Design a protein around this nucleic acid. Sequence first.
RNA 1: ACAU
DNA 2: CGATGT
Length: 136
Amino acid sequence: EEIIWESLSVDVGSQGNPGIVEYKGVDTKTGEVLFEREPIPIGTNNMGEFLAIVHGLRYLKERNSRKPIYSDSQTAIKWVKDKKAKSTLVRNEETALIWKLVDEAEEWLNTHTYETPILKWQTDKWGEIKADYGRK
RNA sequence: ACAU
DNA sequence: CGATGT
Ligand SMILES: [K+]
Ligand SMILES: [K+]
Ligand SMILES: [K+]
Ligand SMILES: [Mg+2]
Ligand SMILES: [Mg+2]
């Protein structure tokens, strides 16, 4: 329908999938970068999309903001609503960091409330989400 | 089949 | 072409 311009948009970027993962959140209206995570050596697209939403929830909660969050990831939206990231990535020594972050994000969801609406960015109708990394 |  | 996910 209509873009809600008063919102936060988040997205993952990577070098390979699985591969090096990063994510960021931007003001949908202005494009200003509000947060960007230092690259994580190995993760998946969906783990990064999930972390990006949870980071957005935490960022907005700390600022008393009721803005919605846009994500282009059906998977990550579902994982956040379930409070469970059902990733297939092997959990071993190489993937320890991403799994630690995912575990901690789940723990945050299980210990806090939020009213932030989590909305699907409608890429087919509106083009690329404003937090996209432009690598495709 | 659809979302990344 | 490879990959992650519902
Ligand atoms: K996309
Ligand atoms: K991109
Ligand atoms: K598939
Ligand atoms: Mg995305
Ligand atoms: Mg993108």
